[PDB]
Paper text:
Site-one protease (S1P, also known as Membrane-bound transcription factor site-1 protease (MBTPS1), or Subtilisin kexin isozyme 1 (SKI-1)), is a membrane-bound protease that mediates the proteolytic activation of transcription factors, hormones, and enzymes required for lipogenesis, the endoplasmic reticulum (ER) stress response, and lysosomal biogenesis, among others. A zymogen serine protease, S1P matures through autoproteolysis of two pro-domains, with one cleavage event in the endoplasmic reticulum (ER) and the other in the Golgi. We recently identified the SREBP regulating gene, (SPRING), which enhances S1P maturation and is necessary for SREBP signaling. SPRING activates S1P by dislodging its inhibitory pro-domain and stabilizing intra-domain contacts.
The map had a resolution of 2.27 Å using GSFSC cutoff of 0.143 and shows the A-domain bound atop the Peptidase S8 subdomain in a similar position as SPRINGecto. This structure is from a WT S1Pecto sample that has undergone autocatalysis and therefore the density sharply disappears after K137, which corresponds to cleavage at the S1P B-site motif. The P6 Val also makes hydrophobic contacts and the P4 Arg is inserted deeply into an acidic pocket where it makes a salt bridge with D218 of the catalytic triad as well as Q282 and S307. Unlike SPRINGecto, the A-domain of S1Pecto appears to interact only with the Peptidase S8 subdomain. Two loops of the Peptidase S8 subdomain (residues 338-348 and residues 372-384) pack against the GIFT subdomain and were not resolved in the map of S1Pecto without SPRINGecto. Without SPRINGecto, S1Pecto undergoes autocatalysis but remains non-covalently associated with its inhibitory A-domain. Consequently, this S1Pecto is essentially inactive in protease assays based on the S1P cleavage motif from SREBP2.
Residue numbers in the entry: 42 to 137, 191 to 337, 349 to 371, 385 to 593, 598 to 616
Write the structure that this text describes.
Amino acid sequence: TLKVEFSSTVVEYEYIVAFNGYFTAKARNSFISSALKSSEVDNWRIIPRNNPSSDYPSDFEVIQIKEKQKAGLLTLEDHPNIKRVTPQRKVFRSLKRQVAQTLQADVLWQMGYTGANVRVAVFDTGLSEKHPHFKNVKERTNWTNERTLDDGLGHGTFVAGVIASMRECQGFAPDAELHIFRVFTNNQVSYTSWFLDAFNYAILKKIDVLNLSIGGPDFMDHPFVDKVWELTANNVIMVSAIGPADQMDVIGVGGIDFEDNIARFSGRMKPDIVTYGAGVRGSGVKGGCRALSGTSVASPVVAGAVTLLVSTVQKRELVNPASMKQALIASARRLPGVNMFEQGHGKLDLLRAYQILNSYKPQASLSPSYIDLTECPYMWPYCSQPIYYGGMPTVVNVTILNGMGVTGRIVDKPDWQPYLPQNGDNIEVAFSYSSVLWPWSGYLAISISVTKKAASWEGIAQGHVMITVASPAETGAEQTSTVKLPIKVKIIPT
Ligand SMILES: *[C@@H]1O[C@H](CO)[C@@H](O)[C@H](O)[C@H]1NC(C)=O
């Protein structure tokens, strides 16, 4: 029903000038003008910005250069304060049941959890001023060149309705504090500078949950991805569709239907989880209800679910991107017969997600939480064949989720411990892994190879890895959480 493609381009002569910090407008201008005094390039100008972030010191600047760009950007990059210069990009988002009760958000509503005092933000095409399905819109800041805060196609209205609503289409969280970020034009066009200014204002606003519908391989570039990491690092639980989502720090979301099938519009394992994204209903542009089926649809489903889950939690101190991701995956109900690269840890379960989140203790975790190369079809393609000595190492890139801190570290070299009675000693596994873990997460890549004594052997070798993640005290002593990763493999003669 609804298809979300993308395309991007670079706009000639315009550059994002990322700074080594957060500067006032004149400081940015003076750094750039000195760096262009050392240089021989004269034909340059700052292309200034009019929006709610213009009233704030910034960590970037948009400039034009037409005469000689290589010398200009090389000289600017060589400026001390100027971290990086990257071209401006132009993206084009091609848009082509009581679900909260079908997930039993009634039971949470019944307890008195509705989304109160949770700032969720929609990075979409806006929300009309006089929509009756909402009660707590706080602001409708704009970031486009179009002079409208309202929604001209609805997608933003549909997303906001699913997250929050009180009418013929019920939203997951009625009492959420809504923040509308019109980052797309009524033609679905945006710019990296628009997104960067909007992300900066989202950081200033301190928005707990962000539903993000921006993708494309080129557009998620160095300033973009860095700003995403900085939001997640500022405790911005981000939710996006896989179609940022496929990054380490964002809750990626896939889409099933109401019969728990994988829909026809549906490395490390992503999505994290799935939920309903076919036949879902949400608010109309001025009013009414409408149903949409597509990949983008489950993302607001999970975003609403997360907003409600955040309201569920007594002490908000414990809610971060990693702990929320951990709950979505631990509570997840596995779909029988779906591999890990379509469903992640299992379709969303709002009530058991609420249960884990209610009992959750700060700790590190792995995704996948175990290795079993003989578990077809979940662990596919690793079960397409067993590991035979003389073959390339089996490499599994494991996400670490450090719910103990935005910064943490592997304390030492992760230890592979084979079971002797189960002849785990017939494999060796090496670790090539990111050392420091930021933000809220890291990675651990494991390269499994059979040993020499079992070149002519057939059977199941087993063992575990004993990793340890440390991160400073967030409450002192480091916060340490050792995590066993069971490993099970079937070996054969070469
Ligand atoms: C694991 O994933 C990360 C992505 O964050 C990547 O940079 C790294 O190279 C991967 N490791 C291996 C061994 O592929």
